[PDB]
Write a protein that binds this DNA or RNA. Structure first.
Ligand SMILES: O=c1ccn([C@@H]2O[C@H](COP(=O)(O)OP(=O)(O)O)[C@@H](O)[C@H]2O)c(=O)[nH]1
Ligand SMILES: [Mg+2]
Length: 351
DNA sequence: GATACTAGATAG
DNA sequence: CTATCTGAGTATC
């Protein structure tokens, strides 16, 4: 059994970028199941073999991490063109890891074709004809299908909590008690404003010491519909392998998602947050049935509620400690099922 | 005359 | 929101 994993639109090198981190992690946890896997990317590296030096068809399984098809500057993007060309040569089933509802697989030829540099490529190089199997992070396959409604070789869908991988790594450990410097914290990107309203609500104009790490920038929040005066402290991005330690700097860490993450997705940050020394607080709308934890104290409806809950968490260590003890318990139960998870994942890639 | 990393705006 | 169009701003071996 020879397994190849690749990121469709992002180069893979180390933990600098997130897409690069997800691919290496996915690479690791799969190797940890006792499988021989390679990461194919743009060049040879510590963790990667080059697309130009490997016969894609020497792999019994081709796993592909989801990405958009973004020709920045209206210019050719080597990351996307090289992986698709690679996928295009494969003749066996392709397993697409759909972890971001906004990153459904789609052919790039239709796009390249109508570009002024179409003459640089051809349909025979870019068109991916192999049958594709979508492995949705969301249990609601109906939505998964709809996101891939326009692609015909996508003929198989299956739910599987891909993003539980962090808590199932071999070296995984919950964070230790940490000296606090913040009341609330949140890590991530602007995600094209799909959460601008939620970010402003829970992180802007609160009076608390809030920090928003990640690639998001203060100047990106300019929608008059969601005005602000006092913004949280914007610090840049940090390696993915450190996120949970970063959250641990605050009393609490916010959980918010897009419109279609609500009661459908249980994202990675949920585990990264739940794993930290930061009391996890979820936006009510994100999980309206409280499926994550059967304890209303972990849920906030608005700014005022978040502000009340954070203040009551500082006002009392018995409460903060209790809530950190509970969430850690919920996580540790899910970790008890590692084998079960590993099993459904193999069966997910037909093993 | 740097290189790498990172969707945004708009009609239907 | 969804389908389709249009094309660079920011951080740094
Ligand atoms: O500086 C940062 C900020 C975020 N992340 C990762 O990015 C994820 C969040 O991605 P996104 O902003 O797309 O939000 P999501 O859709 O996952 O809720 C986090 O869970 C981390 O894994 C990271 O590695 N470094
Ligand atoms: Mg994700």
């Amino acid at each position: 059994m020879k397994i190849a994993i690749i990121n469709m639109g992002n180069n893979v090198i180390n933990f600098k970028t997130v897409p690069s981190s997800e691919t290496i992690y996915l690479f690791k946890v799969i190797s940890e199941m006792g499988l021989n896997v390679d990461i194919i990317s743009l060049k040879n590296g510590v963790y990667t073999k080059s697309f130009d030096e490997v016969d894609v068809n020497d792999y019994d399984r081709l796993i592909v991490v989801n990405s958009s098809i973004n020709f920045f500057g209206g210019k050719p993007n080597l990351a996307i063109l090289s992986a698709q060309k690679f996928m295009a040569k494969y003749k066996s089933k392709i397993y697409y890891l759909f972890t971001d509802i906004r990153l459904p697989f789609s052919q790039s030829w239709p796009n390249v074709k109508n570009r002024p540099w179409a003459y640089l490529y051809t349909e025979e190089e870019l068109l991916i004809k192999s049958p594709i199997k979508v492995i949705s992070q969301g249990i609601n396959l109906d939505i998964a299908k709809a996101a891939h409604k326009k692609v015909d070789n996508v003929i198989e869908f299956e739910y599987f909590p891909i993003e539980q991988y962090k808590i199932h790594m071999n070296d995984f450990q919950l964070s230790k008690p940490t000296k606090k410097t913040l009341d609330v914290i949140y890590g991530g990107s602007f995600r094209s404003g799909q959460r601008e309203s939620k970010m402003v609500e829970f992180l802007f104009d609160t009076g608390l010491n809030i920090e928003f790490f990640g690639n998001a920038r203060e100047k990106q929040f300019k929608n008059p519909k969601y005005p602000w005066t006092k913004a949280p402290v914007f610090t840049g991005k940090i390696p993915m392998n450190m996120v949970s330690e970063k959250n641990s700097q605050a009393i609490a860490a916010l959980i918010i998602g897009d419109k279609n993450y609500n009661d459908n997705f249980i994202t990675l940050r949920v585990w990264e947050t739940m794993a930290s020394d930061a009391v996890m607080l979820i936006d009510e709308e994100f999980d309206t049935k409280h499926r994550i934890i059967n304890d209303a104290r972990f849920y906030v409806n608005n700014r005022a509620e978040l502000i009340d809950r954070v203040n009551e968490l500082k006002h009392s260590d018995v409460l903060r400690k209790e809530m950190l003890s509970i969430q850690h318990d919920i996580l540790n139960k899910t970790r008890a099922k590692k084998a079960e998870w590993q099993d459904a994942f193999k069966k997910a890639i037909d093993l």
